[PDB]
């Protein structure tokens, strides 16, 4: 189950996380209605998220894990292996720009950081437009190596835990997802919503809103709509 494309298309972290979990649960309900056992396919379910600059991305993973674990245990009554949501996080490619390509390594670093902080299972790091050169992939691969090996805070495996901001954000994002679950449910489920093009519409709506505030100068992007290259 992926949500990389949904976010990349323009969906904000709440929409991405909500839709993706919704899609995942749809597969679960789909396999269950074939008379199958929950402990037979749930451990095989892998997830795939995006990490951008938005605050919600810092707690996206932990929220996904809790919503899954609680539901898989209480609702579907599955075993321990099934309650464990494993996911891959890939840094947002949308968040990187063609103008001042050297700046992208900064953004890709911050995004890679909160992924490791929130104890992800798998991480991809984006390069700083052109072809994937062997030099460009090394700078991307170095971001992970520097954080994992050199970075001091990273030596702790639960640095997020305890933080007032993290716990509040975790609760908020969780509830925001739940409310979106309800919105999809009153549209006939995920399939029923797709029948109306609800998800597509909502993604398209948010993609425009982002692309608007970007041009509006309201959402600052360093090197793009502010602090632009004085040469070109």
């Amino acid at each position: 189950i992926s949500g990389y494309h949904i976010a990349e298309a323009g969906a904000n972290p709440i929409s991405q996380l909500a839709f993706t979990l919704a899609n995942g649960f749809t597969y679960v309900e789909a396999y269950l209605a074939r008379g199958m056992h929950i402990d037979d396919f749930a451990p095989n379910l892998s997830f795939f998220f995006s990490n951008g600059m938005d605050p919600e991305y810092s707690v996206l993973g932990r929220v996904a894990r809790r919503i899954w674990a609680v539901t898989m245990r209480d609702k579907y009554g599955a075993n321990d292996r099934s309650q464990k949501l494993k996911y891959h996080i890939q840094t947002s490619g949308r968040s990187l720009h063609a103008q001042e390509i050297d700046f992208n390594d900064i953004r890709t670093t911050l995004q890679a950081l909160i992924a490791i902080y929130d104890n992800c299972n798998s991480l991809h790091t984006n390069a700083y437009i052109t072809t994937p050169t062997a030099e460009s992939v090394r700078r991307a691969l170095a971001i992970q190596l520097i954080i994992n090996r050199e970075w001091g805070v990273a030596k702790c495996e639960n640095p997020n835990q305890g933080s007032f901001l993290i716990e509040e954000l975790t609760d908020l994002v969780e509830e925001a997802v739940l409310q979106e679950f309800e919105r999809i449910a009153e549209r006939g489920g995920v399939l029923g919503a797709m029948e109306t093009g609800y998800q597509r519409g909502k993604i398209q709506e948010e993609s425009l809103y982002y692309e608007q505030l970007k041009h509006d100068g309201t959402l600052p992007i360093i090197g793009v709509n502010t602090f632009r290259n004085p040469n070109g």
Binding site: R62, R65, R66, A69, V70, R73, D74, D80, Q83, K84, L85, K86, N119, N121, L141, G152, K155, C156, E157, N158, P159, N160, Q161, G162, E167, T170, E175, L178
Partner: protein, 157 residues
């Protein structure tokens, strides 16, 4: 949402239960022996769920586990030791998993139900106990099956 409602209620019970027994010990330390408090406390031992009661019960044992320099856990007939400490250049001990220092059992249970340590339900801080030490996948795909294969064999040499 129902799960969270339970966390709130069970925390209140665990909190009240502690507050009562705490006051009970303080009264006996001053001379007054009022078992009227204990009745309300024992009343909340049953009010607390089975799962919730064991969570608080394992908390002191949980603390002693993540306290030392290693993590002893015996699976099958052998055991699996894991290091907890990474020492800085300054000589500071950075624990892999840092536990809360709450006194309130209301906060302890609340934390144990909403965000237990990595490798424990609801796996908020991770699905595994500790991170694996040392995984970089080898991606390739271009041209015909022959070219993609060679790259596969080359990278994975």
């Amino acid at each position: 949402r129902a799960y969270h409602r339970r966390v709130v209620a069970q925390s209140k019970l665990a909190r009240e239960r502690q507050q009562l027994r705490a006051a009970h010990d303080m009264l006996q330390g001053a001379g007054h022996e009022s078992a009227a408090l204990e009745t309300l406390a024992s009343e909340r031992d049953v009010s607390l769920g089975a799962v919730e009661r064991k969570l608080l019960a394992m908390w002191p044992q949980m603390q002693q586990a993540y306290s030392g320099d290693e993590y002893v856990v015996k699976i099958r007939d052998k055991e699996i030791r894991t290091g907890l400490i990474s020492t800085t250049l300054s000589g500071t001990k950075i624990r892999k998993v840092v536990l809360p220092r709450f006194e309130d059992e209301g906060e302890i249970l609340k934390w144990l139900m909403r965000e237990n340590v990595p490798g424990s339900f609801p796996y908020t801080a991770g699905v595994f106990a500790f991170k694996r030490e040392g995984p970089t996948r080898m991606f390739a795909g271009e041209g015909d099956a022959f070219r993609t294969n060679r790259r596969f064999k080359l990278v994975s040499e």
